[PDB]
Amino acid sequence: GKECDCSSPENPCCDAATCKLRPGAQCGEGLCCEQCKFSRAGKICRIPRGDMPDDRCTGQSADCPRYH
Structure with missing residues (x-):
């Protein structure tokens, strides 16, 4: 499926x-x-409240990954 780089068909990027x-x-x-363009690593993509780790982009990934 390497034919779509974005989900929205109206995205300008x-x-x-x-x-x-x-x-x-x-x-x-x-x-x-x-x-x-890919942002930078250490980019908080999701901050979990309570006692969990903070998820941050790796600088090379556009979508925010996880820690599993």
Whole structure:
């Protein structure tokens, strides 16, 4: 399924014609995609309340991963 880089067909970061990144971007969408490019690692994507660890982007992943 390497034909869609974004989920929304109206996202500007990804081309709707091919449904994939259009300009020199690294990601069309994601909790860590600034300017359509992968943000940086150590990026808190989800802060768990209570006594859990903080999830942070790895700088190379646009979507926020997990710690399992």
